[PDB]
Point group: C3
């Protein structure tokens, strides 16, 4: 009495309507359609940067942060706009709840493509369930101000746990300029999205 158009299908044998889906890309979890590899972005809200402090110094920066989850990888991106000219090494540190992944340093949200916040625990940014991470390195950066080149330099990144919480610690090295730069790196998360 009715027909079903692909990707819906009807089995006359058992009188059952099904959805056919490609299993490398889509799956069913708890009876509900989902993706095998959804994109989630955990970020500072739209043009709403986080206020960071250089350790105990009276030196601050605004930071826009995006943490993009692709498969089990996390692409970390930060845009730092320091307020104060400095020589030496500044420590910009981000703290995340060791269970939830929620940023404790400033406000971040899981953000869909519509621009709406998603009510999704950000555990997908945590490197491990067991707190045993090792990840560190350096990226080249270029400091500038008002469109003018200031300095070619570098910034370290390190992933650690302290007092049970997850830290991403960034250390920029400057020689008179304001620490104003963008950098990115990738790390792996062993936390699956199910």
């Amino acid at each position: 009495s009715f027909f079903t158009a692909a990707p819906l299908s009807y089995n006359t044998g058992n009188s059952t309507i099904s959805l056919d889906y490609r299993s490398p890309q889509l799956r069913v979890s708890g009876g509900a359609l989902a993706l095998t590899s959804p994109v989630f972005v955990y970020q500072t809200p739209f043009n709403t940067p986080m206020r960071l402090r250089n350790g105990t110094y009276n030196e601050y920066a605004d930071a826009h942060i995006q943490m993009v989850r692709f498969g089990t990888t996390v692409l970390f991106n930060i845009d730092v706009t320091g307020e104060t000219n400095a020589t030496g090494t500044q420590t910009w540190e981000l703290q995340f709840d060791g269970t939830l992944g929620s940023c404790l340093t400033g406000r971040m949200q899981v953000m869909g493509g519509t621009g709406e916040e998603l009510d999704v625990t950000p555990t997908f940014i945590l490197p491990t369930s067991d707190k045993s991470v090792y990840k560190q390195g350096f990226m080249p950066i270029v400091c500038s101000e008002n469109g003018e080149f200031k300095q070619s330099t570098y910034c370290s990144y390190a992933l650690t746990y302290r007092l049970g919480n997850f830290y991403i610690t960034l250390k920029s090295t400057t020689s008179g300029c304001k620490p104003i730069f963008q950098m990115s790196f990738m790390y792996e998360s062993q936390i699956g999205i199910v």
Copy 2:
């Protein structure tokens, strides 16, 4: 007289067949199934790099460009192959329609993972047109030629609107060499995919 297999369900109360989905991953858009955070790419066509001129000078480059949207984030990547050795700073300007996002400087296409062009207006690349916002910065780049290292240097990027249109302006600085480099940076789009 019929049943439904998950992720399809049937409610006896209201005689209604539904699709059950995970709302952080899938959603309904104007009656139709969609992703919460779809990937979209606006790019130069396969083997069809864009011809760019360095301002008013008789100096040109070919550029392959990809603009990757996920969540509200845009990852911009460019591969610039300059023709002429230069000492100084080159200005590469990309112009896009300020309402539609369409590239005015050369041909770009919205491309699916299928390898087919998608009939999608590329508004998803457009950042905030608030004229008090000056999204910009610098990235480190390496100039080379035919696999040979030439220079470690830098390139600026600046996002602006003027004359109703969206501009990405890149400025590469060279000493002696052709401007031949790849660079990427991230920004945010104001335009929700709905």
Copy 3:
């Protein structure tokens, strides 16, 4: 008798139940629902970095590698930890079967967001089915060791085919530090995911 809730719809003119979907995001392939631009990651397994040799020198490094496919672009990322304070330049080469894409140099797997391996042939990392490619460049890198800056330098990358197989060849230039660095770059794949 039945009703349908969006995204399911019923056409009374032809007695057909359909799933409405947004074609730039979702599609139907061989009667099954799929994504237009799925994310796939081809990577080294967690805690199973690949052992790479510097040509025929007795010099090795361990590499975590992710190759993230979005739309038709591949984001390549490598995290290298070498052992031997290098002398000059070291060449790290990855080989992939030119038909199936499988890494022949060491163990890689297609990994879902779920944290589970996916049974997908990795053709999506191949530049073309034609077995031809021209793509080369340099990225700036920073070598470090145990949190300490060592050198700001560069790494070349080149995409080629030899004897019908696809090669990614990286040449890192160090002055007398261990090759310990991360680098990434993007390239285009003309192999559609269909």
